[PDB]
Amino acid sequence: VINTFDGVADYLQTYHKLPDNYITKSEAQALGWVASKGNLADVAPGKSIGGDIFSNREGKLPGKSGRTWREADINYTSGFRNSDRILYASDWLIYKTTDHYQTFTKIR
């Protein structure tokens, strides 16, 4: 599984897409995922949540018209989701978060 920051970021860059292990929460919900139960590994073995649009409500991330930000879970294996996320733009700027969207740092 390609679920590490470096794996995802190198990948995102050479393929312009998320690796195979990711699904959206809506997708995830459709196969039986309940956030309150921390059961994703059960309904969707070996997958993590990633590919939903991050709204960038608080302008912490570089803005531009035509630019869309997207999110994805990092270092997930089973249980409750962690606080680790990767944020990628349509123009392919990659940022990381480890504090649940509070602070962002450039990775690519």
Curated annotation (Swiss-Prot):
EC numbers: 3.1.27.-
EC top class named in words: hydrolase
Listed GO CC annotations: extracellular region
Subcellular compartments: Secreted
Single Gene Ontology MF annotation: RNA binding
Task of the protein: Hydrolyzes phosphodiester bonds in RNA, poly- and oligoribonucleotides resulting in 3'-nucleoside monophosphates via 2',3'-cyclophosphate intermediates.
Family: Belongs to the ribonuclease N1/T1 family.
Protein name per UniProt: Ribonuclease
Species lineage: Bacteria, Bacillati, Bacillota, Bacilli, Bacillales
